[PDB]
From a paper:
Using only seven Burkholderia species to select orthologs of essential genes, we solved structures for 49/406 essential gene families, and for 56 total Burkholderia protein targets (including seven ortholog replicates).
One strategy that has been employed to improve success rates is to “rescue” such proteins by adding orthologs from related species to the pipeline, based on the assumptions that many of these will have slightly different physical properties that may improve their solubility or crystallization, and that close orthologs will have structures sufficiently similar to the original target to be useful as surrogates in drug design.
Numbering used by the authors:
A (entry chain B): 2 to 139
B (entry chain A): 3 to 138
Amino acid sequence: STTVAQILKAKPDSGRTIYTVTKNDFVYDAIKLMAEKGIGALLVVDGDDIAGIVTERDYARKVVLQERSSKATRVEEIMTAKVRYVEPSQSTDECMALMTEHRMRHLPVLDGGKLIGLISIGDLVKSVIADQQFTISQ
Amino acid sequence: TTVAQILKAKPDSGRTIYTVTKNDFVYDAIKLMAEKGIGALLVVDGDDIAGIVTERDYARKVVLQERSSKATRVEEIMTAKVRYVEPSQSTDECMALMTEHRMRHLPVLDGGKLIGLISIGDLVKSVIADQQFTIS
Ligand SMILES: NC(=O)c1ccc[n+]([C@@H]2O[C@H](COP(=O)([O-])OP(=O)(O)OC[C@H]3O[C@@H](n4cnc5c(N)ncnc54)[C@H](O)[C@@H]3O)[C@@H](O)[C@H]2O)c1
Ligand SMILES: NC(=O)c1ccc[n+]([C@@H]2O[C@H](COP(=O)([O-])OP(=O)(O)OC[C@H]3O[C@@H](n4cnc5c(N)ncnc54)[C@H](O)[C@@H]3O)[C@@H](O)[C@H]2O)c1
Ligand SMILES: Nc1ncnc2c1ncn2[C@@H]1O[C@H](COP(=O)(O)O)[C@@H](O)[C@H]1O
Ligand SMILES: Nc1ncnc2c1ncn2[C@@H]1O[C@H](COP(=O)(O)O)[C@@H](O)[C@H]1O
């Protein structure tokens, strides 16, 4: 088994950086920040406690299709509150099952109740093939 | 495991491809993605593959550019240079492509004929679909 710890150590710097917004932030500001960092999710924090999680999938489904403006809508209105998480001990296979079964591409990592990072379906796919050999022609 | 097997694994053997035209409005693309529970649409120019548009394009190229989805065409935000695979190819190859090129969707062509579409989630499922897990 390859672990969540190992996935984070591979991440740049060294998975320690979690990009974040508060519940009161405008959705528009969430979307601008995602764009600035090249990411598709933000952990929603209200002063150190995990409030929820908001992603590009949330923005595509719950704003303009609901007659809302990202500028006049707050993150809380579209985020998922019941956040599923993993611990650094868990295997990538377990993580992939969770993502598949619950239809989510992001998993915060809590260690003893401390948020230590965040992993995504992309980090998991990379670990599956990262050491395999390919050709440009293949 | 092959792309063909990934397609076979899907409910209608992956025969359905949810599609839009280059002239359609982004809002109609977005509406349709919601309607069908998906994150991408193949963009057709009346029977030829013109591009691909995903929830990521929508997140990046519309309101952040002062545009409205009712007032913007799919062509404006789509990716015109589409990468694809054929059924012969292995899931590892598809995973590498998605990782290296930062895309989560691959149309599947067979002899220049579109047969279906696979996503990063189809690949991840194949990796663990046979594996045993407990709730605990
Ligand atoms: N070449 C690579 O190193 C690499 C790594 C990861 C993903 N990818 C690919 O790029 C695309 C990335 O999308 P994804 O589907 O994994 O989702 P994503 O775009 O949300 O994730 C991209 C990277 O940013 C990180 N990230 C996302 N949200 C974060 C947050 N709030 N705080 C801190 N870090 C965060 C992820 O852990 C991941 O490493 C996919 O096509 C995937 O295959 C490539
Ligand atoms: N339980 C399952 O069987 C299952 C299967 C696939 C994905 N997932 C999960 O659900 C989420 C789905 O996201 P995703 O990131 O793979 O992207 P997605 O939301 O675009 O894909 C969802 C499913 O719809 C299909 N699809 C998407 N666009 C299509 C189009 N234009 N035409 C035809 N089919 C299309 C995909 O191939 C995939 O099977 C992820 O968390 C993933 O892990 C679960
Ligand atoms: N760790 C998580 N726990 C619970 N829900 C999540 C998590 N990550 C994402 N989601 C939600 O699941 C949906 C898809 O997210 P994603 O596939 O990560 O874009 C969105 O409605 C998200 O808010
Ligand atoms: N098969 C593909 N070929 C080329 N570009 C793609 C492909 N799939 C998605 N993209 C683009 O890559 C970015 C991320 O897409 P996705 O991860 O599939 O949401 C978006 O700008 C898409 O338009």
